[PDB]
Design an enzyme around this catalytic site. Sequence first.
Site, short mmCIF file in Angstrom:
data_model
loop_
_atom_site.label_atom_id
_atom_site.label_comp_id
_atom_site.label_asym_id
_atom_site.label_seq_id
_atom_site.Cartn_x
_atom_site.Cartn_y
_atom_site.Cartn_z
N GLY A 1 2.34 5.98 10.52
CA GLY A 1 3.75 5.84 10.17
C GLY A 1 4.36 4.52 10.63
O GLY A 1 5.53 4.24 10.32
N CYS B 1 3.33 1.44 9.74
CA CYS B 1 3.17 0.37 8.74
C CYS B 1 4.55 -0.11 8.28
O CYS B 1 5.47 0.70 8.12
CB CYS B 1 2.32 0.84 7.56
SG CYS B 1 0.63 1.33 8.02
N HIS C 1 0.80 -1.22 0.00
CA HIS C 1 0.00 0.00 0.00
C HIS C 1 0.84 1.28 0.00
O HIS C 1 0.26 2.36 -0.14
CB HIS C 1 -1.08 0.03 1.10
CG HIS C 1 -0.59 0.21 2.51
ND1 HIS C 1 -0.24 1.46 3.00
CD2 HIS C 1 -0.56 -0.68 3.53
CE1 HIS C 1 0.06 1.28 4.28
NE2 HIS C 1 -0.12 0.01 4.64
C1 LIG Z 1 -3.74 5.90 10.21
N1 LIG Z 1 -3.39 5.06 11.35
N2 LIG Z 1 -3.53 5.57 12.61
C2 LIG Z 1 -3.06 4.65 13.43
C3 LIG Z 1 -2.60 3.51 12.74
C4 LIG Z 1 -2.03 2.26 12.99
N3 LIG Z 1 -1.70 1.37 12.05
C5 LIG Z 1 -1.95 1.68 10.78
C6 LIG Z 1 -2.54 2.87 10.37
N4 LIG Z 1 -2.90 3.07 9.01
C7 LIG Z 1 -3.91 2.44 8.35
O1 LIG Z 1 -4.65 1.62 8.88
C8 LIG Z 1 -4.12 2.93 6.92
C9 LIG Z 1 -4.92 4.24 6.89
N5 LIG Z 1 -6.34 3.91 7.14
S1 LIG Z 1 -7.25 4.71 8.25
O2 LIG Z 1 -8.62 4.45 7.93
O3 LIG Z 1 -6.79 6.06 8.28
C10 LIG Z 1 -6.88 3.94 9.82
C11 LIG Z 1 -7.75 4.12 11.06
C12 LIG Z 1 -8.84 3.14 11.16
N6 LIG Z 1 -9.71 2.41 11.28
C13 LIG Z 1 -7.18 4.60 12.38
C14 LIG Z 1 -8.07 5.50 11.60
C15 LIG Z 1 -6.99 3.15 6.07
C16 LIG Z 1 -6.12 1.98 5.65
C17 LIG Z 1 -6.68 0.98 4.86
C18 LIG Z 1 -5.95 -0.13 4.48
C19 LIG Z 1 -4.64 -0.23 4.88
CL1 LIG Z 1 -3.73 -1.66 4.48
C20 LIG Z 1 -4.03 0.75 5.64
C21 LIG Z 1 -4.77 1.87 6.05
C22 LIG Z 1 -2.85 3.80 11.38
#
Ligand SMILES: Cn1ncc2cncc(NC(=O)[C@@H]3CN(S(=O)(=O)CC4(C#N)CC4)Cc4ccc(Cl)cc43)c21
Lengths: 299, 305
Positions: free
Chosen positions: A137, A139, A41
């Site tokens: 950040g 990931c 991604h």
């Molecule tokens: C943004 N974020 N905050 C904390 C966090 C921790 N680990 C991973 C994150 N990122 C993701 O999970 C991303 C971004 N997001 S999101 O919707 O902003 C994530 C969210 C929920 N639910 C916390 C608000 C969509 C998505 C879709 C697919 C894949 Cl593979 C990755 C991702 C983290």
Amino acid sequence: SGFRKMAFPSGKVEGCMVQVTCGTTTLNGLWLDDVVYCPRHVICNPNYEDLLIRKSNHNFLVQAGNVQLRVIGHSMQNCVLKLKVDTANPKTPKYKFVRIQPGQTFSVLACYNGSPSGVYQCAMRPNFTIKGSFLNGSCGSVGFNIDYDCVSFCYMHHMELPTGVHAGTDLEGNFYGPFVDRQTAQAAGTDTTITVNVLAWLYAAVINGDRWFLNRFTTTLNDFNLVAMKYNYEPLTQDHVDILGPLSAQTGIAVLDMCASLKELLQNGMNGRTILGSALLEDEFTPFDVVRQCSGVTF
Amino acid sequence: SGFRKMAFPSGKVEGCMVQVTCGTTTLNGLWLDDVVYCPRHVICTSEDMLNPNYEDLLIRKSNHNFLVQAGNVQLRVIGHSMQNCVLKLKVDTANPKTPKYKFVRIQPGQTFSVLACYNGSPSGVYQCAMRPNFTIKGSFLNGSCGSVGFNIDYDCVSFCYMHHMELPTGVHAGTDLEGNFYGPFVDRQTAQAAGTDTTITVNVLAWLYAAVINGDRWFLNRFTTTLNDFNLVAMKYNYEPLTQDHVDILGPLSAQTGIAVLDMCASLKELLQNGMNGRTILGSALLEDEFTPFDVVRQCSGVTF
Ligand SMILES: Cn1ncc2cncc(NC(=O)[C@@H]3CN(S(=O)(=O)CC4(C#N)CC4)Cc4ccc(Cl)cc43)c21
Ligand SMILES: Cn1ncc2cncc(NC(=O)[C@@H]3CN(S(=O)(=O)CC4(C#N)CC4)Cc4ccc(Cl)cc43)c21
Ligand SMILES: [Cl-]
């Protein structure tokens, strides 16, 4: 004496962490030999082969400490991107990629911008999520175990679910659980307690002098599972009973004798008492973790 | 999201761990530049421990009596001296893996990571806090003496603890890296006992602010308290007194969540009175005191949920 949630020493993994930037997205990569592994991604309803075909090697910026690595090739394997780099990591440890089962534990080296910030221990839940601690950040951060002197990589972080729990893949890019790497409605299923792990932790408490929950009773495996299913506990199998054999011999408490203690704890509670400083029954120590910590195995 | 007991990555410390042997005793040492630091009780027998005269035991030793092993390589000891309860062994090779470091003495309530070692080999890493009674609730078996506690804020390792002993209650006691013990303990097998332990109040408050940041407010109430009334109640539950320094230190978390420190104190008073009523806070059924205000700011997001 003492019983702590203990992680493996993270040094062999720290020497592999790099920063991967593609356009405006920045995340972490695992640099082993001449390949950097990271969530696909980083190139982002996605059509990953279509998005990948328009990228060139020079679009992927890889940073190892203060040095820029040169990407000379790229390919995908399931949900992981593999970036061929010109330099082999001189700090590459002896390693294997292993897929773990729910109930198994591992250490997580949480990273931001290719820089390790913390190490914690956790377990793959029966619902395939992990209760991690990750911010934006993180990931590309990885989960691992150390067996002798070989690092077994078992997890790469990809996403957070609406309940605050986390989802990711093995190092071959296959997700744990029915998750997909896209922004769409996804939710963790109903979770259960890892029964063999709670039993192992009860044996760790007995080894450390906490014996108030022991009783004269025993149970059959079938009667225990009828009780355990009522409290959202995973079924205990004969394999779990065999695996708890060593701890049973060390403490002198038969596995089904410990199951009768667990049954009483479920039907009656702790009555204001704690076990190893906890008011809840702990399920993130496997039988092997209990033996390892109560014996001092080194890496 | 999420809140875990998190340790610092241990790599910078793993590259410093060595094995120290003197006669029949084997423990761990910390190799920084050309010096190996280890507990001075490595020169003692089990008999010596009742009333050891370390100066008398040390004067009888030569450099070649101390065997130092770094991985598969034997280091040559070219000098030795005692500084308080630590032995400093001058070796003929500087550790090429020596990180940027400082020796810091911590105060009760401070947290740190412990890299538990046996035979100069690291086995695990865990997070813990210096208790108000100066002990640590560690996980240490025989052979773990010389294991160290540290913090790694930025790129510099701050060494704050070296393991020396286990007290009869199963808790642990040790020194800073200058060999001064934390607490009224001695490296002697005399009748010693940990003082009555208390809960680190400023840390429980920080952890309640972490729960608010991660989106949980069930425990809040419409009340406030004076600092003096909070301490009168807190001391009845074996909680450490909260000082004005602690209130000042909680200022940033108070501004991020919009909850005044004395309003959070009122919520803590109520949790102590009522218990949790079958609920949890950050996956815990007990009030957690091994996260400092600084650990919460480091681990949590800057945006409250
Ligand atoms: C943004 N974020 N905050 C904390 C966090 C921790 N680990 C991973 C994150 N990122 C993701 O999970 C991303 C971004 N997001 S999101 O919707 O902003 C994530 C969210 C929920 N639910 C916390 C608000 C969509 C998505 C879709 C697919 C894949 Cl593979 C990755 C991702 C983290
Ligand atoms: C032997 N042992 N097991 C676990 C452990 C963890 N850390 C340190 C240990 N060692 C010590 O603490 C030693 C030996 N002991 S002892 O009596 O065997 C300690 C004991 C108790 N109570 C755990 C059994 C006396 C003593 C006195 C002073 C100083 Cl400086 C060192 C020591 C550990
Ligand atoms: Cl301090």
